[PDB]
Design an enzyme around this catalytic site. Structure first.
Site, short mmCIF file in Angstrom:
data_model
loop_
_atom_site.label_atom_id
_atom_site.label_comp_id
_atom_site.label_asym_id
_atom_site.label_seq_id
_atom_site.Cartn_x
_atom_site.Cartn_y
_atom_site.Cartn_z
N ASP A 72 58.78 121.48 20.60
CA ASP A 72 58.48 120.97 21.96
C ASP A 72 59.03 121.81 23.11
OD1 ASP A 72 61.06 120.00 22.06
OD2 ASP A 72 60.48 117.85 21.61
N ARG A 117 59.75 122.38 28.49
CA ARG A 117 59.77 121.27 27.61
C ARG A 117 58.49 120.52 27.81
NH1 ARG A 117 59.56 117.20 24.90
NH2 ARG A 117 61.32 115.99 24.06
N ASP A 128 57.87 114.04 21.70
CA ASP A 128 59.15 114.33 21.04
C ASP A 128 58.87 114.86 19.67
OD1 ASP A 128 61.95 114.66 21.08
OD2 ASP A 128 62.21 112.74 20.04
N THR A 129 59.10 116.15 19.45
CA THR A 129 59.05 116.73 18.10
C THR A 129 60.43 116.54 17.41
OG1 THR A 129 59.49 118.95 19.05
CG2 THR A 129 57.15 118.42 18.48
N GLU A 154 63.80 117.70 15.69
CA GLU A 154 64.55 118.92 15.80
C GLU A 154 64.32 119.72 14.51
OE1 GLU A 154 66.29 119.61 18.63
OE2 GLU A 154 65.59 117.68 19.42
N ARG A 199 64.90 122.99 32.55
CA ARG A 199 63.70 123.26 31.82
C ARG A 199 62.53 122.77 32.63
NH1 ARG A 199 64.93 120.33 26.06
NH2 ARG A 199 64.75 118.60 27.56
C1 LIG Z 1 60.56 115.23 28.05
C2 LIG Z 1 61.64 115.02 29.03
C3 LIG Z 1 62.98 115.05 28.64
N1 LIG Z 1 63.93 114.87 29.58
C4 LIG Z 1 65.35 114.82 29.23
C5 LIG Z 1 65.68 113.41 28.70
C6 LIG Z 1 66.70 113.67 27.59
O1 LIG Z 1 68.05 113.67 28.06
P1 LIG Z 1 69.32 113.71 27.08
O2 LIG Z 1 69.48 115.18 26.73
O3 LIG Z 1 70.35 113.20 28.02
O4 LIG Z 1 68.95 112.86 25.93
C7 LIG Z 1 66.38 115.06 27.09
C8 LIG Z 1 65.58 115.00 25.80
O5 LIG Z 1 65.05 116.33 25.54
P2 LIG Z 1 64.97 116.93 24.04
O6 LIG Z 1 64.12 116.00 23.22
O7 LIG Z 1 64.47 118.29 24.27
O8 LIG Z 1 66.39 116.83 23.54
O9 LIG Z 1 65.63 115.66 28.10
C9 LIG Z 1 63.60 114.62 30.89
O10 LIG Z 1 64.54 114.31 31.72
N2 LIG Z 1 62.34 114.51 31.29
C10 LIG Z 1 61.34 114.70 30.44
O11 LIG Z 1 60.18 114.58 30.88
CA LIG Z 2 62.94 117.18 20.44
#
Ligand SMILES: Cc1cn([C@H]2C[C@H](OP(=O)(O)O)[C@@H](COP(=O)(O)O)O2)c(=O)[nH]c1=O
Ligand SMILES: [Ca+2]
Length: 129
Positions: free
Chosen positions: A15, A29, A34-35, A37, A75
């Site tokens: 992702d 991102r 959600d893929t 890890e 990101r």
């Molecule tokens: C997809 C996405 C993730 N995020 C944030 C929420 C999550 O915060 P936390 O890191 O605090 O959990 C994190 C999840 O991304 P990943 O799935 O890449 O880890 O990225 C956003 O804020 N907006 C978005 O649209």
């Molecule tokens: Ca992920």
């Protein structure tokens, strides 16, 4: 929404991907998915799927939604297209991501994604097997 140019710098995982956008390197991102890890079940397959899709593309495009364009980690947040095919939707259709992180005002393509996920789930594909 509208599509904007970018070029691949490096696949990262299911992702995330490094693109050059407006001439600057950025990690993107994918919106609404959600893929797993890389260390998790179907993580390697998700990463391989997204890698092959972006590396094989003649043309990568980025499409921002109406809301936040960068997250708290810096990101970019976008829908990514490989020769006009949305990576976000394709991951859903193959059972390699779950619809996730659906925030109000950045969810233009929610129902397209959920549809794809429903079809994957019907087919018992990958994460749904
Ligand atoms: C997809 C996405 C993730 N995020 C944030 C929420 C999550 O915060 P936390 O890191 O605090 O959990 C994190 C999840 O991304 P990943 O799935 O890449 O880890 O990225 C956003 O804020 N907006 C978005 O649209
Ligand atoms: Ca992920």
């Amino acid at each position: 929404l509208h599509k904007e140019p970018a070029t691949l710098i490096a696949a990262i995982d299911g992702d995330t991907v490094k693109l050059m956008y407006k001439g600057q390197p950025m990690t993107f991102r994918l919106l609404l998915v959600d893929t797993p890890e890389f260390n998790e079940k179907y993580g390697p397959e998700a990463s391989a799927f997204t890698k092959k899709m972006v590396e094989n593309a003649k043309k990568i495009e980025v499409e921002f939604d109406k809301g936040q364009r960068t997250d708290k980690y810096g990101r970019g947040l976008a829908y990514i297209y490989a020769d006009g095919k949305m990576v976000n939707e394709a991951l859903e259709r193959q059972g390699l991501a779950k619809v996730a992180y659906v925030y109000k005002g950045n969810n233009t393509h929610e129902q397209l994604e959920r549809k794809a996920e429903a079809q994957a789930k019907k087919e018992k594909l990958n994460i749904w097997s």
